[model samples]
Each structure stands twice: as structure tokens, then as C-alpha cells.
Target: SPVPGNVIGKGGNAVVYEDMEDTTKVLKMFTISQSHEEVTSEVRCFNQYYGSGSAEKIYNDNGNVIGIRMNKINGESLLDIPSLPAQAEQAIYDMFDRLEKKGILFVDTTETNVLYDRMRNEFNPIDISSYNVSDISWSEHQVMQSYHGGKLDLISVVLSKI
Candidate 1:
């Protein structure tokens, strides 16, 4: 997708743009081609798990595959919400539960990636392209192993001061 409208979001890999045909959908194009494979894999996974928290793959302006079209969640992100709901934790857990059931691994989740939808009575992943693996069934803790300083436990110690 060439991105017919203005920017709505921009991250390390991509800047999201409004879809031309539908206001309810968005187009995400990677900032660099190196991230293409990783994001593509994530989008492919989303395509199979379409719903309130999934996305569909799209092509570039040249008709070559390069991006994804996702339904805008139309909810407030964690950073925008003043209060975190009681079901918030479970809502996130449920997201992981669904992904795990489908043999997908959602890497570390943060306030930005998860959104609070009052109408839906639950949370949804707004940025799901940040993870890897589809049929391997990985978890945040597993991701932590690669990030949390291995066996000696150094990440928490490293971040405690900062």
C-alpha cells in the first residue's frame, strides 16, 4: 500500500497510514526493508487470526508485498488511560492465551501495544508486529531469557538503577 492518507502512528520499524478505501483500516509500511521479513511473518500470523485484535496483509504501491492493513481498534492506548481496569491483566493474559493456542508467541507487551476498549469490555493488541515465531509457542518469559540477562539474572539489576 502507498498510504493514501496522513500518518497515524510511527514506530521503530514502520509508520502507519490511513487506508484509502476505508477509514476503519490502516496501512503499516516498514521504515526499512531489513525489518520486512520479521513484520511480514507477524502479519501472516495475524491474517490467520483475524478478529478484533488481528491484521490483514497488504501490498506496496508497486503491487509488491510490503505492508499490512489492520482494523483500527478505536480505543485508548494504555498511555492515554488514567485507570487500568481490573480485567486488564486478564485481558492481556487472554491475548497471550489465544496466541499460545495458535502456537504464536507474543514478545514483551507494554503500555503502548495494549489498548483499553471500554465497549469491547477487554483489551486488544494494537501493535502485534513486534514479535516473532508462529508455530513455536514462545512467551514473554522466554523472550526475557534472551533479554533478562540469562541464568545470572542481570536485566532487572541493570534496569533497577535506571
Candidate 2:
């Protein structure tokens, strides 16, 4: 019987809520439709990429990972931003590029997955549940090119309009 708190975000598979006991953290709970493996995989990825700057750490729950507790990131979604400066744009590209070099393929590199901290000039990814963490044989340019041709391409299009 956990007390309900205000919801902060919702996605296809889970809902995020502000942690009542810890203001600095948020709780992500998967819906009933999600299988145990799906839930565990998300936690596994979170743990693997914990300090990679791509995602926050998950609180240990003694092997029960029905829900995840992660540090709260306060910022606007990159999707909401009308446009970004050249510096910010390059920074975003570089961030993903570095991750690729480390053998992490962020499949969902959509704008909505990234949060831009205007004050800190930093970008933090909010979702890492669908990333491919194995060694990738694809070159960095090929990976980035595919992204630029897919959802991430929209970012460049948006940047050019402004």
C-alpha cells in the first residue's frame, strides 16, 4: 500500500511519479502489460549505463525491480525547444557519438527522449530502456547517419528553420 504521488511523466510502457519521500528522485513504474523480463531489462540497462551521463542511477530494491527509483532531472524536453544553438546541437551529437563509441546504441534517439538543461548547458537522456548495449560493429558515422536519416534527422531540420 504505497501512497500515490503526483505523476511527472508517462510513456508507452511506464509512468513516472515524484517520490514523496525523496524530492530529488522520481519513481518509474511499469504497467501491468509489461513482462518481468521487460522490466528487468530496463533496470539492467540503467545499471550498465549508470555513470555514463546518459541516465541516472537506479535505487536497489533487494532484487524486486517492479519499479525504478532514479535521480530527477529538471529541464525541458528537446522536443519542446523550437531551436538550438550550433554549440548545443554539436554537443548533443557528440554526446550520442561518445555513447556509440562505447558500444551503446541508443535506438530511441528521438528529441523527446533528451532533456536540455538551459542553465547548465547539459543534456540528459530520460529513457534508456530500449538501448542496445552490446558491442556494435557499425561505424560511428554510419550509426549517426542512420539516426540523422531517421527520427534524429528532424532535429537538424528544426535547427535549420530557425
Candidate 3:
């Protein structure tokens, strides 16, 4: 929750609130023991493939937990929106294709991490990582991010098509 000044939003990754300029920016924090290097790796991965995602795009990275300050998007999520529209479905797959091309793997790409905005009609990434989230549901297929749409599907139908 915002303290003294006005607050816009808050989440596990970051919090968006009003700054001196009255413009809203996210304040991302990390646990006490989280390494700066680890956070940087994730941020780097996020920065690497943004358009392919569906969250507030990174504004900038300043070498801190708040690796970025993105423009807030007001909208509902498609996570539980049931079946994804054909276009949206392909978009995700295409996004995954690009990820493979870059030799990147969005390990923890669960529905929770995906964000969709009907207004902007855009999809962006809120979280990403080079490290595989073995702790969570993941396939250790060592997917090669190549242009080939199916060279051994690592992601899924939705993730390999877009």
C-alpha cells in the first residue's frame, strides 16, 4: 500500500505510484537475500523479449530491483478469460518463436505472468528469465530458439505458432 503520497498499484514484482512529477512509476523491490546479479539476469531476459509478452513493457533498467519503470496499463487479464482468441493465440506463439531465435527461454510462462490489455490491443511481458523454473511446471526440452516453427516443439501449440 502507498504510504504518504498517492499510490497507483502494487504487485509481487513491483509497485506503481505517483512520483514528484505526479507521473506514476513502478517501484520494484527484492527480498533481502536476492542477489543483484540474479535480478539483473531476469531483467535482461525481460528486456530481451518484451513485445512478445503481455504486461507493462520495461521503460528502463537502472541496475536495481526496480529494473524498469513502465507505463501502467489499466485492463483485465486474459489468463482466466478462457479460450484465447485466434489472433491472441498466434501472437503468443510468434512471441515464443522470437524468443527461441534469441536463444532465450521464458521458463515460467504460466497464465499468471501473462497480461492482456484490450485497449492498447497489445501484449507485453511482466516477467521472464533465462533460468528454467524447474521449481514450477516446466519442460526441460532445451528448446533452441530458431526460426523453425516446430523443430521439436518445446513450448506448446500456442507458443510455437504466433
The residue-by-residue lDDT of candidate 2 on 97-156, one tens digit each, is 655555566666667777887776666667764433235665656765665565466446
Rank by lDDT, highest first. Answer: 2, 1, 3
Ranking by TM-score: 2, 1, 3
Candidate 3, position 108, lDDT:
55
**Highest lDDT among the candidates is held by which one?**
2
In angstroms, the error of model 1 at 142 is: 4.7
lDDT of each: 0.60, 0.63, 0.48
Q: What is the lDDT of candidate 2?
A: 0.63
Comparison by lDDT, 1 against 2, better one: 2
Q: Judged by lDDT relative to the true structure, which candidate is superior, 2 or 3? A: 2
Clashing pairs in 2: none
- Backbone clashes for every candidate come to 2, 0, 12
